Each structure stands twice: as C-alpha cells, then as structure tokens.
Amino acid sequence: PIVGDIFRFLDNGRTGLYENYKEFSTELNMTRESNGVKVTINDVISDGRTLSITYSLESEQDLGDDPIILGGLDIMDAHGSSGSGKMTKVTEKKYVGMVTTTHHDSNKKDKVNFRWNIEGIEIPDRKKSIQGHWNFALTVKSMDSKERTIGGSSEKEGIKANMEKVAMSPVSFILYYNQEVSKGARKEWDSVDVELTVKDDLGNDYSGEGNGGSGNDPYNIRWSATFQKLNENATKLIVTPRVHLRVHGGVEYVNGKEKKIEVPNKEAKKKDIVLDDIVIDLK
Amino acid sequence: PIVGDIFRFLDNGRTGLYENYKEFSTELNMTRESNGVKVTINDVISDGRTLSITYSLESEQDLGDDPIILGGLDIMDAHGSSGSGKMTKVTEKKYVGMVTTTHHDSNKKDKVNFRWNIEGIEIPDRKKSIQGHWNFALTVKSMDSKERTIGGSSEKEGIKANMEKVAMSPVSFILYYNQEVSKGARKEWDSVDVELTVKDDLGNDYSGEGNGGSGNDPYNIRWSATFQKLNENATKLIVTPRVHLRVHGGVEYVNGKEKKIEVPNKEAKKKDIVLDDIVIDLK
Amino acid sequence: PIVGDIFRFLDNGRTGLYENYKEFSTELNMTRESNGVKVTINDVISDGRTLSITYSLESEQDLGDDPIILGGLDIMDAHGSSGSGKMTKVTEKKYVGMVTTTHHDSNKKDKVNFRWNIEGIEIPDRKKSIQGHWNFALTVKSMDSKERTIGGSSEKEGIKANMEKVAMSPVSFILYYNQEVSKGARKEWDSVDVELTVKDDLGNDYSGEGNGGSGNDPYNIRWSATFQKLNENATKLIVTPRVHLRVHGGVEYVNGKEKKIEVPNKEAKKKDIVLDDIVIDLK
C-alpha cells in the first residue's frame, strides 16, 4: 500500500533504470513518528557504490505540492559523497520518494552504514515547517557486482573522455570515467560537461543517471553513471561522449560591414555541443 | 523579560503539561550572536527521558510570521531520537520557542549531553534566510524519576495496546507503551494509531503529549507520552486506548439495487475510531 | 571567470575589509556536481581565527533571486563557532558567495580542518528545493598573525567595554573584547549591544565586521571584529565604543498634566545609543 513499487513509480518518462530495483531490494517498512508526521523507509538497496532508499511520508495535515525534507542521508566513512532525491504526491497527506547517496571511497563497500536524520519538513505552500526529529540508523549489505578496470578514450577539441571502470550488478551496471580539458580549450569555455550515451553490440540503448562528479579544478571531473540491467547476450558496449560547452550576460549586434549579422561574442560560437566514440569489451 | 515563563506561554489551549516546568528548570540565559541575530537558550530541563529547552530569538529586522530554524537539537549517544518544536511571535524582532528531544536509549540518562547547532533562519515571508552559525554545546543533569515496569493490555479488532512502563517526576509523568496489529487487521487498514487518555481513581484527567513512536513495521509501534504532575492522592490510573483507523483517493456512488446508497470502498467503513480500557496501580 | 575576485565583488557599499583577501588566498576551484548543480569552492583563507571561503553555484535551471544553501561549513574541534554567509546573482544560473566561520577555541588554529556539507538548495522563488549532497572536506594552513594581549576600558551607564586582544595579519586585523552590564543597568535595559569604531593616530578609519559574540548571560558578551589592513605608519588605535540600548509592544499618551506630552514607558527613554573612548598601543 501507498504505491506498490516506489522505484518504478518514480521512474519517469525516459524510463528503465529502476525497473529491477524493488525485487532486489530489502524491504523494511521501518517507521518513525513525531509531530503528526509518520516517516517510513520502505525499500533498501546498495550497489556497493550507491545506496538507494525508498520512503513514505504521511501527515495529519497538508504537505502541499513540494514539501522539503530538511536533514540528510549520510554514509559513515563515505569518502566524498554525492546524491539526489525525488518525491511525489499520492494524496495530500501521502508522499512517496527516493533518496540516493553515492560515496567516493575508491573501493566499493560491502556493508554501507548510513543514517537518515530528518530535522524538519518545510511546507513551502503554507510558509511553515514541521520541526522535529525522525532518525534511522542502519547498515545494509550490498548486492555483489563484477567490476573490471578498463581504459579507452577519444579526444577532440582539447577535451577528451577517459573510461576507467565498469561494474555489473544483477539489476544495473556502472560506468566510471572522467573528462580532461586542455589549456587551449579551458580558455574559450567555462562549463565543459561530458555525457555518455550507451549502446551494446546489439541494437540496445541504456537509460542511466549520473551519480555525481568531482574535480580539483573546474574541468577535470571524475564522474560515474548508472544504467539499466545489462543485456545478457551483449558482448560490447558502444559509448558515445556528448560534450556540452558553454560560456552571456549581454551581447551585441554589429550591422556590419554590410549587410551581415554579427554578435560579440559570437552568438552561435560560445555555447555548443560536440561528440566522439568508444568500444568496451564486456569480457 | 521577553515572556516570563516560556513553557506556560507556549502551552495552548488544552493546557496543563508545562505548568511546573520553569520552576524545576535550570535557567541559563546563555547567548549566541551572529548576523544581526541573537539566540538565547533560556530554561533547561530533562526528564531523564526527554530534554526540553526554551529559547528566544531576536533580530535586527523582521522574522515575519513563521521563521524556520535550520539545524537541530542533538543528544549525544541518543539511541534513536524524536522531537518537536514550537515558536511564537512576541514582537516582529522577538520570538520565543521551545525545542523538545526524546532519546530511545532503553534506560534514561542521568546526564544528557546535547548540541544545539543552528545553521540558518529562513524567513519565508521575505523569501530569504539568514545564514550563519549559532551553537550551544552543554550537558544537563536530569531530574530524578520513579519508574516502575508495568503490564496490562486490552485487545479488540486485532489490534491491541500494551502498557510497558510508568515514570513519575515531580513535574510530570510518562507512559510507555506499544500497539500490536494482527494479520487480519493489517489487511483492512494502513494507519492504525493508538492514543491514550488518562484519568485517576479520583475524577481527574491528564493533559499529555506524545514523545514519538518507533517500529520495524508500519504497525507495531512503541510510543510514549508525557502527562501532567500526577495527583498525590491518586492510587490508580485509568487508561483508555483510542484507536484511529484509516485507509480514499477517489470513490464511487452505486445507486443500487434501489434505492439504496452505497460507496466502494465503503465510505463509512474505511476510516474509523474505536476504544478499550486499562488499570494501572500506582504502587 | 564568473567574477574575478569574489571577496571584493561581495564587499558593498561601506567597503575595504576584503580588499586584500584574494591575493592572500589559496585558490582552489575544487568542484562538486549532483542534480544539475555544480558547486565550486574558489578562494580559501584563514585568519587563524576565522575561515573565509568563496564559492560559485551553477545550475541547469533557475535559482531565482535568493537561493538558500541548506547545510553548513563546520570546523573540526571548533570550540564554539559563529559565522555568516552572503550570496549574489551574476546570471540566473550563476551565483557567487562567501561563507565565513569563526571558532571560539581560546588559541588560534594553525591548521583549520573543515567540512562544507551541502544538503540542498532551496529555491524559494519556485517553492522547491534541489535535494542532494555536495561535500568538501579539507584542511587549510592559516596565515600568521601577531597577537598582543591588551587591556583598557571605559565605563559609563553601568555598562562598560573591555579590550582583550589585538591580532594583525597582512591582510586584516582583529579586536577581541567584551561588554559588562551592572545590576543597575540590566534592569532598565534588555538589549545592550557594544559596537566599536576604529581610528589610528593618524586620520584613518577602519571598516570592519563582527565575527560573533558569546555569553553565559544575555549581557556580558565576549565579541570580536575584523578590520582592514592596519596602516603601517600607525602607532596607536583610537577605539570608540558605541552602545545601543533597547527595551515597546504598545504604549500610551498622557495629555497631562497640561498641556505636556508624556508616554509610558518614556518614549525617548527606552531605546537609546551612548559613547566612550580607548587608546591601544600598537607596540
């Protein structure tokens, strides 16, 4: 009850990644209640890399349209961490959502100890928050995954994508990789962002979702993304790096020398998208 | 100054619980000030079970109608914890409030070490927050209480309330207890909530307030509540468990078979309130 | 890029303090990215007393006018701490800001270990937050400063300002001090606030900014403030303590005894500003 599978309920309208999550999840339906607010933490699961959690939020009284969870899901001994969260209305007193955390410890964790510590629910519609504490402290065993360390790359505008690792669970698979930007390229561009699109030998496409990036400069970022149950008959992944370059503010028309149209800075120049292409042996 | 007794000022319009809190409180009026905002932490007190704190908030500039404290009151070595907070305007630059935290360590704590760590004041009226840090780190000695471990219960619809413990301070008293729900009952209901109402042998009623609940499933929840200075001539508590059952979304009219009115699901059925009744020896 | 020197960009319209901060800063441009939001932590610097950090915030999608950083900059082994933060729009997807934290460890710290842990970006304009994690864990070496322990004071209305310490970095200098309030004075006043204004032997004035205050009662507060690069030819600081006294709610007119105007409480009385004056040997 509420919604039967929160992972699929939340997986919209480009779709697929969460498809096998509940079945591989540990169901807990463990509850905390203060101040008219019952928080339940439903399905639980851990890549080894990323920990995803499913919850409900029920109240005595309207949360409205976009309640804000104050607090945080925290992994003990995460080295860095990144994350995401969604939430969706099912009734004006029921909400289901998902919180996701990715640690940046070099190796994956067999057991993830985490604490979900909520300190408040803001109800922006009603200008107000519900104060209190709702806490869960628990550790989860990770599903196993096969990781191979891989290489492979393509360059172009200065600006170049390196594969690092691949990891395959029963439910999903992960691509680890990073972007490098040259002194040339850094200079004409201030937001280089390298997306990968995934196919296998075989026809198929993979839906996926970033898990966050990191860097010591604004340009050389290690990233990783998670994608759909790898197809069992696939031999090879074909990876295309989409690169989205950007710099605007205001700007100029130069009706010039005549009668030709011309902007400083160059109006098509100064924020574009480019491509490349890599082959990974599932082996 | 500000308001003389924040505990009573905050205790509205069903009334009584906080009545003796200030007198048994440790007054500290310890202050922190950054960014135009002076936070004072006035009265302090600890059940052994729950820690309640009283504060003022003064600013240079309007908080408006419902300022939001970003941060948290945290008990060191709390096992779980729950809590509540209220705040009330006294001037457009003065606010008084109370924060309450309940730990779920099996035994009560003689000393409670806590940290009140504020990271911000949102001013939803003005769409804005005041960023900063205001921190108090301090430990409080608990008032003593007499706790007896008790049993006693009543069942009905599957769905059954068990007393666990009673604890009596000079200022207030606590009932520990839990609800159990059967496979039968769980199935027709998704929000069973067991409230207790308290009398003594003697006429009197007790105002009280939940301190939070906990469970490993959505149904079997350990709870506790706090109630008024127990009356000294009372011998026995008479406890009535109010049970509020719920499931709606949309719904149906069936003008049928004729001419009788009929909803799926059954429109009076599927969210009700029931009762029972228990006797506890103050002994 | 973005803005070249965030410290000066943020230093408005009484101006000077941040003027030499970037040059003495450690530039890091270390980045974290989740959920469409790239947070960069640009310039870094530490008084020994206070740690100031500069950052950018870039998004895929409007932050609007006053985004709210949920989370906190935290110093490990800070004894108490206080802080401040500003942020300013540069584009509807670019924001630059500064966060400042002051620890109240008796001695200054040669290395400050801190964690910047962001758990969310509220977008009050759009009623909404972006959930996730963006974390930086890093330690900074402090710039050296010359601290002398000093005394000196002036009294008046009961109510009296004591110098404690002075500390001079290459970029800025700090005055440590405290206010004391007598039983007389405490009684007619509930918000005594002692500001200092700074000159040297020499003509010059110093822009400065509180770093927060602390006290075990609402009145005797240790404070400190930071001011501009001390002028090299200065021999002595001339410090004037401005004292702002306050108590209003409502109030009265007494057309009386005739025809003279008279308010209870006394309408000019009950919130004023007074002064004093101290000489510190730079020695």
Automatic annotation (TrEMBL), chains A, B, C:
The segment(s) forming the DUF4179 domain are 1-59
Taking every annotated instance into account, which residue ranges of this chain make up the domain DUF5643?
Answer: 150-258
Q: Which UniProt keywords apply?
A: Coiled coil, Membrane, Transmembrane, Transmembrane helix
Does the record bear Membrane in its keywords? yes
Top-rank lineage group of the source organism: Bacteria
Q: What is this protein's record name?
A: Conserved domain protein
Residue span relative to the full protein: 78 to 365 of 366
